[PDB]
Amino acid sequence: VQPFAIWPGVWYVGTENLSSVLLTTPQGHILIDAGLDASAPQIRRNIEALGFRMADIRYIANSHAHLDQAGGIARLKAWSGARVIASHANAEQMARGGKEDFALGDALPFPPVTVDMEAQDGQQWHLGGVTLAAIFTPGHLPGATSWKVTLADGKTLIYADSLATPGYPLINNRNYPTLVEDIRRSFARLEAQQVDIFLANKGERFGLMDKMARKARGENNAFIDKAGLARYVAQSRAAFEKQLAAQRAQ
Template sequence: MKRLPIACLAALAASCAGAAKAPRSPWAASNPDWVEPFTPFRVYEEIYFVGTRGLASYLIATPEGHFLIDGGLPENAPLIAKNIETLGFDVRDVRILLNSHAHFDHSGGLAALKEISGATMVASQGDRWALESGLVPGAEDDPAMAAPPVKVDRVISDGENLTLGGATLTARLTPGHTKGCTSWTMTAGDSEILFFCSATVAANRLAGPPQYEGIVADYRATFERTKPSRPDILLANHPLFFDMEERRARQVAGDANAFRDRESFPALMARLEAAFEKALAEHTAKAIEK
């Protein structure tokens, strides 16, 4: 493992200067844990948590370079790089940048992280426009939803593999939350790992008019597609979705299987599907009233 040189930290500070000096996102004001530091740690095998208390980013470390999934808010980029350094790795060894979905709280730091690392940005076609424009389809005029644009170097398709240093990640398109919402699966040790995108409704409009055409069908297809899935370890872009802090506390206390739970993902999806159907009924009723 390589320590990050002082010169690299200085370069990172320069490349991320805009993010570091910019006012905090208006969303961070109401979600302070999104910018709150959290001690980085090894989750399992070559997988490391390098995000904040409220927004997850993951480093998958290999001898030939690393994957980095998600960049948090724009102002999170320097902290993510620092977390990578704290673990003994060099951010310049990140070879492939991945994104769960093109919302500012997960894509905001990608441009700065790409600049310092020189990594290849890989994303789905469905989210390519949003990443490269920095805008959210259906909310193009809302500055609070914008993120720094990042160029997509390679478009990934459903079921396509990315391999680096013996680690293989497979793209699983799970649209709805965004048009190109992408989950990632991999095998580490003797476990199947799922980095789940999202299936929350959040700020999306499901009707009157919908956030994007086909959004309801996409959500329902994702719920159906994921019903058979029971990964050994569920990791998500919001730590609360997999009880990260509670599991980390158990891990620190000596529980080597703290993150293993094959019932976690089915339980999460059942809750999200029920919430989706409730939101759809509400959005449809409001659209009819108009």
């Protein structure tokens, strides 16, 4: 619940398990994701509780354009002056406020927001000694993006997007035809990443609460988890392949 340091220069400012990660630098900050629209005022408070200025955020990066990752972006952009970075498909869905979702339709809208800088696969941004790089990991949404960070101290952090496919029709899905091929390739791309710090779009996917408690009790390396991303992919792959096999049997 309370915001805290994951690692020097890396802070958790999300609301409950909706991840929002602040990378602080002498040139200003990067924020990855922003919860629900309702999370936005709390994220401002959480950043402030850590002693930072939300107005110092220079970039807001989105993993994927669902209401619980991009919902707070419109307000945080407005208040902070940050430039929003996201893949093309996420930018299109954000412009629609989450509507026309291949699986949800218009069921779960959120405040529309304009992406200022479209991310291409492998594209890098540099700020205050930190490098932020986009890793396209489609499947949960066509534009789903994981983010690779090289910190000023040389540590590598990966913020992995969702690999979940909740209720998704996988066979002849004419709204998102390539989803099976995409997600299987995302599994491989992510599990091979060299990573010191493993984070993800929801706290339960990276052990947020257990690691936070250890960290608060003096385990400085609690978020160093070099095999955690590979474990997350394995857990996701097993569930996905069971899903595809079950749907083939329908």
